[PDB]
Ligand binder design. Structure first.
Ligand code: CLA
Ligand code: CLA
Ligand code: CLA
Ligand code: CLA
Ligand code: CLA
Ligand code: CLA
Ligand code: CLA
Ligand SMILES: CCCCCCCCCCCCCCCC(=O)OC[C@H](COP(=O)(O)OC[C@@H](O)CO)OC(=O)CCCCCCCCCCCCCCC
Ligand SMILES: CC1=C(/C=C/C(C)=C/C=C/C(C)=C/C=C/C=C(C)/C=C/C=C(C)/C=C/C2=C(C)CCCC2(C)C)C(C)(C)CCC1
Ligand SMILES: CC1=C(/C=C/C(C)=C/C=C/C(C)=C/C=C/C=C(C)/C=C/C=C(C)/C=C/C2=C(C)CCCC2(C)C)C(C)(C)CCC1
Ligand SMILES: CC1=C(C/C=C(\C)CCC[C@H](C)CCC[C@H](C)CCCC(C)C)C(=O)c2ccccc2C1=O
Ligand code: SF4
Ligand code: SF4
Lengths: 88, 74, 39, 742, 140, 80, 151, 30, 63
């Protein structure tokens, strides 16, 4: 009997497929490191300010100082340019 | 050469306006859908009954006419 | 026989015979008077 | 108790029903109220299910209709042999096959159309044929128009006999149902009978007519002076002088000294280097062995005695832990549903035709076929299309079986049920692999086009850049080339000169076959093939698995196989029917086969076909341009379509001008199809109302009230003109190009 | 007085990929019930064949239309009667069909008209006459 | 939810109620036609808008009319 | 062999040797994303570690500088750049999906049907800490691959 | 080059990302 | 009441397939509760393949 009004969670099959509530199997001191070093990135509102502005500034720096050895578009034309079809 | 393609062009003008005039003048209703005005300019259709009614709205006549206008200007 | 004459009158059959006769006529006019551009 | 069971005089022969359009259908028979009647009459003509529900009476209809088809084919062959006899240069072609162009059609002089009678050689003027009949008749040892005349009369007789049998087995002696259901007897009689006695008796002609006459042709003696075929039967010494095995007669056969026949029964392989085709001694030995296999295979199933299986026993005995009851119940399904039979047969017959396309190009079975580039490009393309159409037909009647014949209460089957129970897992998986294939095949081209446009040819997927070598195909090639000395000791040379290795064969300065190289470009176009085929199966297989129901339409099966939709609700349900999946799968089949034949045409002109020098300098038709050009879409636009379209668009004023007109005509029909596919019948019915009014104003309206085509017909008309115009365009493009440069 | 809903057995079915999804946990789902005179194979509206049990029969389904499709098939082929319900994630049940104990095909007193306009269709006003009102011509 | 409406030209033949795949419609007693019944649309929140009902209707000019309107997960026929 | 999912033949799924086998169920219940009672922050650190480390490969070895000496540095920056943009996707996914007070939308039952506390990964803060771990983990994982390959 | 190397990545990478992220949150809000 | 049987009536209902055409009166429902009591037959079917329809007394005109 797979129908029950008092347990609508089992009637619809709302089961955790592979969720294991086993305790943390990590180096517990590395945890204190990860919990206090990765901590400032755990506010989504501030992180969005950070990723948006930090990435925007970083993307701007890398593109502003990109050498000609990397970007043909900044290295520029080297050959002499050829004329237009009607002596243009 | 200029004669032939000018009649091609007159074909395109006449056919495109056919789609568009037929679209405007039947927008309120046709015998296949005499209450079309109650459904508005664009609606998907009126279902497969009465023989089939895909592309029966005035919006669809516009949609068809764009192909003919693109043809003509081409 | 009357059933056959009814079938021979059905739209497709009467059409091929009609258009066959037509094609033969137009072909022979074009064999006798070819290349007519005027008239 | 397998026996002949027939009913006497079931249906009276009468013209009464010829006079009554739509008699087969109770709805249609009442006569037209509207023009829609005209179309349903034709759409339902061969839908024998809708005429009668009696399975016996359905089977009798398909049986006599089959005779009708066989009658038509024989009449078709009669004309082919008759034109070879009466309107051809076949007799002249036998003396000079390297130069004279096969022609078997001559147009009457009217309205300037004589220009289609081209200077094809042999003192003849006609249309160059690409069906390949000349290479067949030569390989059959046919030497005169007299022999074709007699074959044409025999074909005409067989056409009458087949037509008589169709009328006979429907109006006079119509087999009972249980006669058709004796599938054991039929399989035995087709394996041993049709396939077996066909290959054996044809082997006899190859031995006593085809081998000897081709030896004289290849030696150089004039066909008018070659001894007539019956002289090799009346006088054995003629045979024995060509093959001394005939001296001992049928004695070495029964004494198991079969190795004595090694001069006309061989296992050489490769191609006869003076003719360009497979060795006629290898072919005759092929039909011999093949005939043996079928004669014994036609003894597998049980009939009026004890030995043999019941096919039901073999099915009911195969079932696993993942499948449950397995193939139980399939024998009742395949003995009561004609569409289930037709789905399998269309699937295999279609697949087999595509194989015939490959095998006939890489192992040219006819003399002087490999160097008639026009015939060979036609044959491969023709059989690809035939194969692809038959395959798409398998999905329709698989879909038709699910709507009409599937019945889990009477004819259950756990294999079919198991697939229906996880069709969402199948279709979603095929959906993802299609997305993977498309990105990692066509997307690489887009990468290349974008890289090449930006001046960065080092970043392309190319043989001179990031290389995608087809290692596995390359490996198989190098394997078969080493088979004759190693894994196939009896074989002298490889089964095909395509097998990456060996040398080359030329006929008349034209290359026949060389090893076909497979590089990066061949890698890309092969993953296009896998992509296009996958999407074709996705659409078609989805159509059959949800033919009865879906989360969107729980009672879809009640709406029939062929219906436009279930209305604008549920967000819109246009094209939910299985029939609409077949409609969509035709476009994708068309897509897939189009690039397959394009792949074929470009490869052959680039890396295989061409002219060989006095010293061996091969000049290919397009000079190896396939490797660097066929890896971008711009390469196919520019170096393939734009360049090879030269011939057809400058064919006017020459005997190839009919291809010029067909090129433009097929473009037209293709564009015309878009009117149907892009619009909808509501627009058209309203338009017709204004037109009907005008007729009423002048008292000229028909009592058969004009209706727009039905929604489904619109789609059928659309896809039909799309395929006809599309394919005909390539037809006119291929023939003009290959006849002008081949 | 609408029927009840206990915990009757379900038909014999091996399972398919066609059944309930997350919507049932979070929005709603449907259950159809019926009484069959004998065990027999029938087609599941979600694909495949199942065997209904004689007597009571409960079946969960994702949509109302799946229920009515199965039920329509129970009356036609099997000549059995059926009902179904809408079940919410709070356990709240809602009887749906046949509404007033009578199938909607047959007239039945006590039913009140909903959506009946007492005029022919061609008498709807023009859209301009209901512009800037919130009504369509078919609402008056 | 889609809007469904019945007009008084209805002859009460019931064909739309039988066609409906989600039980939107029912017959109710009426004095206006010989059959003394008229259609009614009390459950349009289950209405998907297939218009099977209009296909069924015999009256010159439909007595049952479906006006597709605001979409819900019921009108869109979603099982997910 | 092939059973209905959890014995219910009317749930839209199957239980096959791929979905639920002893080895499959073990490996899937051991991934950091199915550790329902452990800290979501430490889950994301392991996730970012594994992915950022994986992303260095394709960028460096296939990028527009793959055949230059500036290869390892550019694809690594491109690898971290891909981690930066993914962290914005993870962030906006949480801002839109979970509110500051909603409970976990994770299953509160088990395979046997008993009540446990839902995975707090499926909450506003539980997501905010997961994506914070991914970003820190993804940047250091890019650097760790950049450390082993070109240092 | 001193300005295109600034505005081309700004209008073609940053602005669309900021716009796509902004619109994703407005359209998903309730 | 209504037009006699076999009367030739012009149809005046605008939304009718036979609008401004004519049909033949089959019967007139004499029950005064019948809103559309005039049954009319036509010689050509409409788009639903129906050949007969009920009309109001004000929608029909003998000709
Ligand atoms: C149906 C229309 C039609 C008409 C009006 C004609 C009329 C004519 N034909 Mg013709 N013919 C037709 C169909 C027709 N034919 C068909 C279908 C064929 C094919 C079998 C022929 C084959 C044919 C031949 C072979 C000859 C004619 C000839 C003639 C002419 C006789 C003098 C005459 C004007 C004769 C003629 O004019 O001599 C050149 C002649 O020799 N016809
Ligand atoms: C697939 C079969 C096939 C095809 C496509 C062709 C095609 C052709 N043949 Mg050929 N032929 C064939 C079989 C075929 N043949 C066979 C089997 C024979 C031996 C009997 C011949 C003997 C033959 C000769 C002797 C000649 C041709 C010729 C031709 C060409 C012109 C024919 C023409 O205009 O007729 C004229 C058109 C008609 C007669 C059609 C008349 C239209 C009527 C009204 C249609 C009747 C429809 C009716 C309802 C059904 C009748 C069925 C009845 C047979 C029971 C054309 C390329 C000619 C040619 O090449 O000239 C250079 C020519 O002289 N053929
Ligand atoms: C003159 C001889 C003759 C006569 C009078 C009849 C009479 C009858 N047959 Mg019979 N039959 C005959 C010969 C004959 N048959 C032959 C030779 C065969 C073998 C094929 C059959 C096979 C047969 C079957 C299988 C069936 C009948 C049926 C019928 C009945 C109605 C058929 C009908 O409407 O035909 C009119 C039909 C046509 C004129 C169609 C033309 C037929 C040919 C084969 C078409 C080929 C055209 C070809 C494709 C070229 C077109 C393509 C191109 C132009 C684009 C009627 C009692 C049917 C019946 O009783 O069911 C109720 C039925 O199911 N017969
Ligand atoms: C041995 C092969 C075979 C056989 C026996 C059948 C038999 C059948 N099919 Mg099937 N089919 C096949 C192959 C086959 N098919 C293939 C290869 C496909 C893929 C294209 C299909 C796709 C298909 C669909 C999609 C449908 C069928 C249907 C049917 C049934 C009705 C057929 C009918 O009345 O048509 C009457 C025949 C016609 C009206 C002919 C129409 C003209 C064609 C389409 C154009 C031909 C163009 C020509 C080649 C070029 C000339 C152009 C020139 C005239 C200018 C019948 C049982 C129908 C059905 O409902 O089954 C129950 C249906 O809807 N089949
Ligand atoms: C050239 C036109 C065209 C294209 C590109 C497609 C594309 C597709 N069709 Mg389709 N189709 C077409 C015409 C076309 N169709 C026509 C004319 C018909 C009518 C018959 C159909 C009928 C049809 C059906 C019935 C089916 C498809 C399917 C598919 C999909 C196959 C899976 C795949 O390769 O995904 C990968 C996508 C591509 C290869 C497209 C190109 C991708 C580009 C190169 C990558 C771009 C990268 C990035 C996004 C850059 C953009 C950035 C920008 C936002 C700034 C795919 C989305 C099947 C499907 O959905 O299977 C999953 C399916 O069942 N189509
Ligand atoms: C096609 C994509 C792609 C590419 C090009 C690479 C490239 C690389 N991977 Mg890699 N990887 C990929 C996908 C890819 N990965 C995927 C999908 C996964 C699964 C998540 C991994 C998981 C993975 C691990 C776990 C490791 C690598 C490592 C490596 C590096 C060792 C190769 C070497 O010896 O130098 C190439 C040598 C010559 C060309 C000469 C190399 C840069 C190793 C690494 O980064 O070391 C620090 C390593 O340990 N890979
Ligand atoms: C009016 C339309 C217009 C258009 C289509 C362009 C197009 C372009 N500009 Mg330009 N620009 C414009 C006005 C415009 N400009 C004006 C008015 C200024 C002075 C304020 C500039 C100053 C400028 C600089 C300094 C640079 C460009 C550059 C560029 C190129 C790259 C895109 C970019 O960085 O934009 C830069 C855009 C701005 C600085 C914003 C100013 C433009 C207005 C304020 C925004 C327009 C909004 C738009 C119309 C929204 C309409 C849709 C709306 C209905 C939703 C591109 C060819 C780059 C280049 O040359 O590449 C090689 C570059 O370096 N632009
Ligand atoms: C592929 C490997 C393969 O051939 O598996 C074969 C596997 C074993 O089948 P059974 O042994 O149950 O089948 C016994 C008979 O039904 C077939 O002879 O069949 C499947 O379960 C199909 C799996 C489809 C999985 C698609 C991926
Ligand atoms: C091309 C063509 C044709 C023709 C064909 C022909 C010409 C055929 C022939 C055929 C033939 C002419 C055949 C034959 C056959 C034979 C056989 C098939 C045989 C068999 C035999 C056997 C089986 C054997 C047995 C035995 C043994 C085993 C041991 C010892 C004893 C004996 C010897 C008895 C036609 C006109 C139709 C049509 C068109 C095309
Ligand atoms: C596929 C195809 C095709 C082709 C066809 C063919 C080519 C066929 C062949 C076929 C064949 C080629 C067949 C054959 C047959 C044979 C047989 C079947 C025989 C038989 C015989 C017999 C019957 C014998 C008898 C005897 C004797 C004589 C003595 C001893 C004993 C015995 C009894 C054994 C075509 C083009 C149409 C197109 C479509 C598709
Ligand atoms: C153009 C076309 C129209 C109209 C085209 C139809 C009506 C075809 C007309 C076919 C023929 C030409 C009608 C006349 C047939 C008679 C046999 C002609 C007799 C005259 C003699 C010359 C034989 C619609 O029916 C429509 C159907 C649904 C999707 C879109 C399409 C489509 O786009
Ligand atoms: S097919 Fe034509 S009628 Fe049916 S839904 Fe699509 S548009 Fe509406
Ligand atoms: S179908 Fe038309 S007439 Fe028949 S009941 Fe429903 S609305 Fe009234």
């Amino acid at each position: 009997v797979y129908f029950d009004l008092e347990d609508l969670g089992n009637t619809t099959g709302q089961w955790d497929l592979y969720g294991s509530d086993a305790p943390s199997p990590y180096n517990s001191l590395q945890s204190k490191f990860f919990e206090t070093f990765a901590a400032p990135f755990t506010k989504r509102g501030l992180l969005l300010k950070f990723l948006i502005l930090g990435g925007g500034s970083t993307l701007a720096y890398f593109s502003a100082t990109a050498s000609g050895d990397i970007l043909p578009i900044k290295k520029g034309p080297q050959l002499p340019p050829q004329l237009g079809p009607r002596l243009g | 050469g200029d004669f032939l393609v000018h009649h091609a062009i007159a074909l395109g003008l006449h056919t495109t306006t056919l789609i568009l005039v037929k679209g405007a003048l039947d927008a309120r209703g046709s015998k296949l859908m005499p209450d079309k005005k109650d459904f508005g300019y664009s609606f998907p259709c009126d279902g497969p009954g009465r023989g089939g009614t895909c592309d029966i709205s005035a919006w669809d006549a516009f949609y068809l006419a764009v192909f003919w206008m693109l043809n003509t200007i081409g | 026989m009357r059933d056959l004459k009814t079938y021979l009158s059905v739209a497709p059959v009467a059409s091929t015979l009609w258009f066959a006769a037509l094609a033969g006529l137009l072909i022979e006019i074009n064999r006798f008077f070819p290349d007519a551009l005027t008239f | 108790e397998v026996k002949i069971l027939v009913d006497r005089d079931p249906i009276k022969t009468s013209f009464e029903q010829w006079a009554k359009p739509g008699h087969f259908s109770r709805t249609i028979a009442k006569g037209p109220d509207t023009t829609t009647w005209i179309w349903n009459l034709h759409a339902d003509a061969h839908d024998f299910d809708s005429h009668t529900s009696d399975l016996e009476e359905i089977s009798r209809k398909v049986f006599s209709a089959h005779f009708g088809q066989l009658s038509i084919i024989f009449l078709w062959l009669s004309g082919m042999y008759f034109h070879g006899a009466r309107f051809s240069n076949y007799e002249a072609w036998l003396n000079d096959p390297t130069h004279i162009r096969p022609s078997a059609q001559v147009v009457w002089p009217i309205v300037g159309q004589e220009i289609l009678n081209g200077d094809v050689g042999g003192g003849f003027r006609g249309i160059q044929i690409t069906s390949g009949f000349f290479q067949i008749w030569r390989a059959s040892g046919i030497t005169s128009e007299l022999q074709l005349y007699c074959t044409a009369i025999g074909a005409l007789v067989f056409a009458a006999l087949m037509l008589f049998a169709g009328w006979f087995h429907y109006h006079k002696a119509a087999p009972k149902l249980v006669w058709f259901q004796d599938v054991e007897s039929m399989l035995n009689h087709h394996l041993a009978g049709l396939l077996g006695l066909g290959s054996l008796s044809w082997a006899g002609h190859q031995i006593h007519v085809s081998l000897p006459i081709n030896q004289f042709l290849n030696a150089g003696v004039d066909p008018k002076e070659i001894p007539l075929p019956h002289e090799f039967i009346l006088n054995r010494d003629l045979l024995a002088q060509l093959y001394p095995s005939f001296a001992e007669g049928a004695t070495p056969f029964f004494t198991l000294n079969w190795s004595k026949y090694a001069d006309f029964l061989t296992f050489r392989g490769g191609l006869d280097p003076l003719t360009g085709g497979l060795w006629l001694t290898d072919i005759a030995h092929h039909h011999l062995a093949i005939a043996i296999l079928f004669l014994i295979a036609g003894h597998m199933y049980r009939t009026n005695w004890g030995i043999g299986h019941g096919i039901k026993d073999i099915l009911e005995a195969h079932k696993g832990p993942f499948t449950g009851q397995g193939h139980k119940g399939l024998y009742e399904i395949l003995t009561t549903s004609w569409h289930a039979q037709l789905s399998i047969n269309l699937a295999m017959l279609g697949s087999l035709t595509i194989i015939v396309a490959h095998h006939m190009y890489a192992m040219p079975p006819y003399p002087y076929l490999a160097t008639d580039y026009g015939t060979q490009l036609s044959l491969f393309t023709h059989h690809m299309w035939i194969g692809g159409f038959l395959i798409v037909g398998a999905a329709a009647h698989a879909a038709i079986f699910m709507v009409r014949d599937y019945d889990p209460t009477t004819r259950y089957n756990d294999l079919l049920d198991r697939v229906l129970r996880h069709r969402d897992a199948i279709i979603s998986h095929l959906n993802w692999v299609c997305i993977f294939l498309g990105f990692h095949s066509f997307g690489l081209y887009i990468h290349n086009d974008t890289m090449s446009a930006l001046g960065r040819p080092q970043d392309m997927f190319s043989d001179t850049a990031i290389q995608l070598q087809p290692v596995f195909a390359q490996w198989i090639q190098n394997t078969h080339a080493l088979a004759p000395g190693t894994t196939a000791p009896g074989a002298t040379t490889s089964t095909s000169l395509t097998w990456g290795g060996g040398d080359l064969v030329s006929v008349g300065g034209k290359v026949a076959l060389l090893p076909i190289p497979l590089g990066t470009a061949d890698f890309l176009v092969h993953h296009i093939h896998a992509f296009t085929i996958h999407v074709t199966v996705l659409i078609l297989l989805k159509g059959v698995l949800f033919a009865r129901s879906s989360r969107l339409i729980p009672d879809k099966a009640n709406l029939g196989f062929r219906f436009p939709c279930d209305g604008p609700g549920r967000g819109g349900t246009c094209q939910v029917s299985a029939w609409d999946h077949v409609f969509l799968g035709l476009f994708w089949m068309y897509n897939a086969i189009s690039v397959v034949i394009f792949h074929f045409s470009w490869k052959m002109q680039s890396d295989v076909w061409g002219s060989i020098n006095d010293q061996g300098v091969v000049t290919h038709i397009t000079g190896g341009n396939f490797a660097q050009s066929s890896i971008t879409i711009n390469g196919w636009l520019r170096d393939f379509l734009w360049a090879q379209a030269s011939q057809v668009i400058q064919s006017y004023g020459s005997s190839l001008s009919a291809y010029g007109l067909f090129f433009l005509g097929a473009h037209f029909v293709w564009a015309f199809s878009l009117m149907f596919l892009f619009s909808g019948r509501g627009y058209w019915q309203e338009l017709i109302e204004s037109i009907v009014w005008a007729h009423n104003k002048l008292k000229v309206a028909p009592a058969t009230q004009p209706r727009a085509l039905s929604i489904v017909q619109g789609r059928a008309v659309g896809v039909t003109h799309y395929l006809l115009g599309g394919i005909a365009t390539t037809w006119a493009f291929f023939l003009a190009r290959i006849i002008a440069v081949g | 007085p609408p029927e009840l809903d206990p915990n009757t057995p379900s038909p014999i079915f091996g399972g398919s990929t066609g059944g309930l999804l997350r919507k049932a946990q979070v929005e709603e789902f449907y259950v159809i019930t019926w009484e069959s005179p004998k065990e027999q194979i029938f087609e599941m509206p979600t694909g495949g064949a199942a065997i209904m049990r004689e007597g009571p029969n409960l079946l969960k389904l994702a949509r109302k239309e799946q229920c009515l499709a199965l039920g329509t098939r129970l009356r036609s082929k099997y000549k059995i009667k059926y009902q179904f319900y809408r079940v919410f994630p709070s356990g709240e049940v809602q009887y749906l069909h046949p509404k007033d104990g009578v199938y909607p095909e047959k007239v039945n007193p006590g039913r009140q008209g909903v959506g009946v306009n007492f005029r022919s269709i061609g008498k709807n006003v023009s859209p301009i006459e209901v512009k800037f009102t919130g009504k369509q011509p078919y609402d008056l | 939810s889609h809007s469904v409406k019945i007009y008084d030209t209805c002859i009460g033949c019931t064909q739309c109620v039988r066609a409906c795949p989600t039980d939107v419609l029912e017959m109710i007693p009426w004095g206006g036609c010989k059959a003394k019944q008229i259609a009614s649309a009390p459950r349009t929140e289950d209405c998907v808008g297939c218009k099977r009902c209009e296909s069924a209707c015999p009256t010159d000019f439909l007595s049952v009319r479906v006006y597709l309107w605001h979409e819900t997960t019921r009108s869109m026929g979603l099982a997910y | 062999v092939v059973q209905p999912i959890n014995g219910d033949p009317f749930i839209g799924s199957l239980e096959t040797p791929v979905t639920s086998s002893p080895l499959v169920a073990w490996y899937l219940s051991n991934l950091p994303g199915y550790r329902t009672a452990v800290n979501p922050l430490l889950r994301g650190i392991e996730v970012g570690l594994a992915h950022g480390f994986l992303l260095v490969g394709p960028f460096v070895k296939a990028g527009p500088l793959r055949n230059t000496e500036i290869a390892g540095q550019a694809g690594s920056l491109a690898a971290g750049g891909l981690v930066v943009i993914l962290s914005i996707c993870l962030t906006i996914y949480g801002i839109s999906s979970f509110n500051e007070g909603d409970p976990s939308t994770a299953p509160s039952l088990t395979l046997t049907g008993r009540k446990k506390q839902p995975d707090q990964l499926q909450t506003a803060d539980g997501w905010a800490k997961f994506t914070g771990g991914f970003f820190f983990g993804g940047i250091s994982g890019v650097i760790w691959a950049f450390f082993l390959l070109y240092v | 080059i001193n300005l295109p190397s600034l505005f081309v990545p700004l209008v073609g990478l940053l602005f669309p990302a900021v716009a796509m992220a902004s619109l994703f949150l407005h359209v998903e809000k309730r | 009441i209504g037009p006699k049987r076999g009367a030739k009536v012009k149809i005046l209902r605008q939304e009718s397939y036979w609008y401004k055409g004519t049909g033949s009166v089959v019967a007139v429902d004499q029950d005064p509760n019948t809103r559309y009591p005039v049954v009319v037959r036509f010689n050509k079917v409409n788009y639903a393949n129906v050949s007969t329809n009920n009309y109001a007394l004000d929608e029909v005109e003998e000709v």
